[PDB]
Every structure is written in C-alpha cells, then in structure tokens.
Amino acid sequence: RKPIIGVMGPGKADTAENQLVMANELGKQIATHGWILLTGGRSLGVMHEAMKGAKEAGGTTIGVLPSDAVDIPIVTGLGSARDNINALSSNVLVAVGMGPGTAAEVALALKAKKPVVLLGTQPEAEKFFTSLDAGLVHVAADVAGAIAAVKQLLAK
Amino acid sequence: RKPIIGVMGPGKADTAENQLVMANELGKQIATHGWILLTGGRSLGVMHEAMKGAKEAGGTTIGVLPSDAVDIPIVTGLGSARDNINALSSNVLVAVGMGPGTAAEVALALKAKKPVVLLGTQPEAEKFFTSLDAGLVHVAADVAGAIAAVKQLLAK
Amino acid sequence: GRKPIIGVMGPGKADTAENQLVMANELGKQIATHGWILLTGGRSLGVMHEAMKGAKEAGGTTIGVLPGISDAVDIPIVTGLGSARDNINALSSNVLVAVGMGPGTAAEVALALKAKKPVVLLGTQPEAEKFFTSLDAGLVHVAADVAGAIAAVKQLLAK
Amino acid sequence: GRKPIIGVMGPGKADTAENQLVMANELGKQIATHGWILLTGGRSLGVMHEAMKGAKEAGGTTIGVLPGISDAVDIPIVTGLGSARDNINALSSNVLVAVGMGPGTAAEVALALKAKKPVVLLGTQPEAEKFFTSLDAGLVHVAADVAGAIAAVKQLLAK
C-alpha cells in the first residue's frame, strides 16, 4: 500500500500567498515521492493548492468533504463544524499554516499518537504543539524539510 | 472519475453461505465493470467477501473503518455504533442481505435521495424499503440483476 | 436515582398525518406526567415538536437535539454533525418511541436495535412493524395507541 | 428563559495536577450556584469529574457526555461517536471553560473558536494562552483563578 500523507491548512480567506506556494510545492513532492495525498475536497486555500500540485505531478488524491484534481471523493455526511479529512487514514499529517480548524486537526492527530509536521506555522503554534507532545511534533522550515521529515517518519 | 459502488451487509455471524457467495461474485463484477468498490474494511461477512472478489478481479477497493484486499483504508475515528462506510461517497449502494446496521445505512441512503439495490434481502425488507421510497429502491433477484440495475443507474 | 430518558422520533412536517401530531403531543404529556425526561429533535416542526410541547405543558423536562429553537426546549444539545442523519443522541434514551415512519426515523430505530435498546412503534404501518419485528422480535414493541406505548415504556423501565 | 449551559473541559487523571482538580471542583460549585447547567465529560476521572461533583454538591444540574457513570451526572448524553475526540457536544454551551490543557482539550477549544464561541482558559500554561489568543483575541479570556473565570463567564452571559 502506498503511504497516505495528510495535508491540513487554512481556507482561502486565511491562507497567505507564500503558504499557497508552499502547499502547491508540498503537493508536487508528495506525488513525486509516490505517496497518496489526503486533504479537504472543498476548501480553496492550502488544501486545494496541495491537491492541484499533487495532480500536476501525476499523483493520486483523496478529497474528503461533508475540482477535477480530486481523484477519490470521500463524502462524510458530518458537516463542517470540524474540518474532518478522516486524518487517522494518514501515515503522517502535515499542516501548512494555522487557524482554528487546522489546530483542532493537529491536536486530534497528537491525541491519536500520530506524527505531525508543521510548515509555516508561526512560533506560538510550534511552541504550543511541541508543549503538547514534543516527540510527535516536527517543525519544518520549508517544503524540502517537511518532505524530509515525512520520509524519515515513513522509514520509522 | 470511476464510479464508486457501495456494498453493505451483515457481518460474519449473520451472513448465510449463499449471501457470502453473492457478495464475492458482486465484488468480482464491480471490478470487471471498471468500478471502485467502497465497503467496510473490518467486517468479515458480506463486506469482506465483496472486497476479496473485487481484488481477485483486479479492481480497486476502499475499505472504511473506525486485509490485503483493502487498497485505500479510510479510518473515520467515529467508532462502531453505526456501520458507517462513508456511503454518500457512492453513486449507487448495494445491500446484500439484511440486519440492523445494514437497514440503517439503506435508510440513510434513501434519506439522501440515493438509489439502493437490494440483493438477498427477504420480502419484509424489500417491501419496507419500497414503502419508504419506491422510486429509489431496486430489488435484485441475483447478482446479474444487481449489476444490471447499477449499470442502468449509472447511465441515468 | 436518575430520571429515565425517553426518546421520541418521527417524521417532520410534510410527511406526518394529523393523527400522528395529536398522538405525539399526548405521548409527550404522558412522558412528562410519569416523571420522565423527553429527548427528541429540537427543530420545531412535526412529531418531535408536538411531543416537546406536550411534555412542557405537563411540566416535564425536555432535551432537544439539533445539528445547528422553541421555548419548549429546556436543554438544547447541538451535535455539530450532519443533517444527513436525524441524530438525537438516541443511545442516551432508555427506550425509543417512533411515532410514524420515514427514512430518518427508520435509521434511528435500526441503530437503536443495533445497540440492543428497546423500541416502541406507534402509528407505523404494517410493513414497518413486520420489518422491525423481523430484525429483533425481542426488542420491538408495537403499540396500538398512546396508552399502549406508555404502558410498554413503563414495563420496560420496571425491568 | 433557558438556563445557561457552561461547558468544562480538561485533561483526565494522569495529566492533571492536584491544583487543577481543586480548581475544577470549585468552578463546578460556582457554576451551579449561579444557576447554570454544567456540561462536561461523563467519564468519572480528572477535571471533568471534579467539576461534576462540585456542581452536584451546590445543587446544580449536570450533563455528562460519554461515547459509551457517576451518580453526580444527572443527564447522561451518549454520542455513539469515537473516543478519538473528547466530544462533549460543546457547541451546546454558551461559554467553554478549559481547566488545564492536553491534546483533546486543545481540539475542543480550537473547535469552539472555529464556531465563534468564547472560551475561558484557567490553569493553562503560557504557551497555550498565547497560542489561543493568537487564534482569536476577541474570544479567548485568560483567567487567573476560579473567581476570574466565573466573572468572565458572567460578563459574557450578560452581553
């Protein structure tokens, strides 16, 4: 089975331009490394950019929702009070940027003892998540760092 | 995008031998028609047999859970009070046999105005579901009938 | 020393006959009069709203479950889950009573039986009664009227 | 004319300091004394159990949410959802108070902010206070003690 890498981040209103670029490049790299991308299938900031990037590099995408870039739409029927991407399906969860919904998904991943890679979250986030579980939180400085952390974690 | 056909039915204790055979043959046919099979990824009566059959015919399988035959495991983190297979992801839902959990999923599909094909449910079930929504309930006498109903519904 | 919680389910406005609205209101009255808590949908329309009005009139405590509200609801429980299911957190109830029948109701009754909880069917048609009884004969109680439903509930609680 | 519902969240047994247990009990007392309903987890261990004991001692009404129970719980709500989330149907609460902090608590606080509900942080460490305040400065109230928490809640309800 191919690894499944989850991607979470803010929506369109709350994603900065550099975060969009990071998300698009992360998605490309997920695809090139032979991994399946799991993210939100409706949301049009980080999650859509990640999807696009993965598809542009020929990878397989799972979009979770309550775009042509979505290969496998998974429709949860849980509505949207939570940005649920069925993230427990992922081997590793990557957050690009930060916001309330992203925070909740990162915290729940840590609850389930799953590793999280934080990319472009500012210092409070990094420090706060590290305080919850230092052993499971990986802070990435850039996309290449995030991919490298993912690679290591899959090797473990 | 390939069609996604959902399969629901009872677990190991409550699936009769002929239902197991039907489920395995349905899974084969789903695969041969170029469709993705969506079913429970833990449950070891109808749902496992469907999975096996699909894989034996070279098809792609999505297993939903709270086997090597599962290609894409989707882990919901919703526990098991409901036999949730994220069935709203399906174009058509097929029930093979009947039991409380299967009944709930068929009723919820009808709630969402999605077609359901009933295979090897006895008369009370057929009559009861038809009473809920006649236009959306398709009673199949055998696997070939169920596939044929699915084919028609995808053409619509 | 906890008060029993009786769940009530039924179809909404469009798919409910007036006899069902009246039965639901009376049922709500009797539930409260017996000192039981009513648990139902909190969204203000058919069977569930009538039950809620009935219980409040008789002085009972009401719990109304919403995904995302009448003054008849004492305690609004907001689940933040879909509208895809008529979820009323029914596993909380000691007994679930269905007044009439539709797809959402049917799902909840079936999930109650999956949980091995008893269900009382009031004003459902023969197909339903026969179908749910085939799912689990020991947990499905068919009631001919509100009195019969209340008696079924009371006996269940006494066990 | 509905009673306010105040939600309380915190970590379970293993990850709770005794000061937090004491704060939670006092908080529960004060919530009940103000005539408010306590909504918390119904599973009998750390902060949430202490809060529940406190509210019951002061005569308040308690709602304890479980996936699948102390005599201190008046109304057990059983969600039939995972243990993957410490779901207490918190969207039901007018204000959510966190006493201490761990991953489940953090998720619920973050989801409250996503819903634009106010949150009171009591006995959380600076990292948390600073992080949640960066998420939404207008909805996050940092409380230095139980009195401060209660005053924050009371002011919020008065608005």
Q: Strand order within the widest sheet of chain A?
A: 4-3-2-1-5-6-7
Q: Any idea how many domains of chain A?
A: 1
Oligomer: homotetramer
Question: Most extensive interface: pair and counts?
Answer: A-D, 24 and 23 residues
Helix % of chain A is 25-40%
Strand content of chain A: 15-25%
Count of separate DSSP helical elements of chain A: 5
> What name is given to the CATH topology of chain A?
Rossmann fold
**Order of helix and strand elements from N to C terminus of chain A:** EHEHEEEHEHEH
Q: What composes the largest sheet of chain A? A: 7 strands, parallel
Structural class by secondary-structure content of chain A: alpha/beta
Terminal-residue CA separation of chain A: 16 Å
Query: In CATH terms, what is the architecture of chain A?
Result: 3-Layer(aba) Sandwich
Shape, per Cα inertia axes of chain A: globular
Q: Which CATH class of chain A? A: Alpha Beta
**How many extended strands of chain A?**
7
**Compute the gyration radius of chain A: what is it?**
14 Å
Protein name (chains C, D): Molybdenum cofactor carrier protein
InterPro entries (chains C, D): LDcluster4, LOG_family_nucleotidases
Short account of what is shown:
The first copy, chain A, is an alpha/beta fold.
Would you mind describing this structure in some detail?
Chains C, D: InterPro entries: LDcluster4, LOG_family_nucleotidases. Chains C, D: This is Molybdenum cofactor carrier protein. 4 copies of one chain form a homotetramer. Chain A contains 5 helices and 7 strands, in the order E-H-E-H-E-E-E-H-E-H-E-H. With 156 residues, chain A is α/β, with parallel strands linked by helices. Chain A has a single domain (1-156), classed as Rossmann fold (3-Layer(aba) Sandwich). Chain A has a 7-stranded parallel beta sheet, sandwiched between helices. In chain A, strand 2 (36-40), helix 2 (46-56) and strand 3 (61-65) form a beta-alpha-beta unit. Chain A is globular. The two termini of chain A are 16 Å apart. Chains in contact: A-B, A-C, A-D, B-C, B-D, C-D. The interface between B and D is small, with 7 and 8 residues.
